[PDB]
Design a protein around this ligand. Sequence first.
Ligand SMILES: *[C@@H]1O[C@H](CO)[C@@H](O)[C@H](O)[C@H]1NC(C)=O
Ligand SMILES: *[C@@H]1O[C@H](CO)[C@@H](O)[C@H](O)[C@H]1NC(C)=O
Lengths: 50, 50
Amino acid sequence: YTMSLGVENSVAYSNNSIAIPTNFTISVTTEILPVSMTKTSVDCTMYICG
Amino acid sequence: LTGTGVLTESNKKFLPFQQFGRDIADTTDAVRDPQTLEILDITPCSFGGV
Ligand SMILES: *[C@@H]1O[C@H](CO)[C@@H](O)[C@H](O)[C@H]1NC(C)=O
Ligand SMILES: *[C@@H]1O[C@H](CO)[C@@H](O)[C@H](O)[C@H]1NC(C)=O
C-alpha cells in the first residue's frame, strides 16, 4: 500500500482563539547513545604469517 | 592437521567418525588423538603486546 504519514488535522485557528492547557503530565523519555567500541589490536605479522 | 598450541583434555563429545573440531570462524578448537581416541582441546600458545 501507499503509506500514510499520520492523522490529518485542521488546527482550530482563528484571529481571536487561543487554547491553554488546564493540566499536565510528567513524562520520562529514555534515550540510548553508544559511547565506545571494543578496543582491539592485531599483531599483523601473526595474522598474515602465523 | 598441523598447528601450535596448548593441548589439554576436554569434555567435548565428538561423533565416532569425526576427527577435528572447529569453532564458529573455521579455527580448529579440538582434535581426536588417532591412537587413544580422546578429544584434546586446542588453545593457542600465549601471546600479547609488550
Ligand atoms: C491531571 O491529570 C491526571 C492524570 O490524568 C489526573 O489524575 C488529575 O486528576 C488531573 N488534575 C486536574 C486538576 O485535572
Ligand atoms: C592402539 O594401541 C593401544 C595399545 O595400548 C590401544 O590401547 C589402542 O586402543 C589402539 N588404538 C587403535 C586405534 O587401534
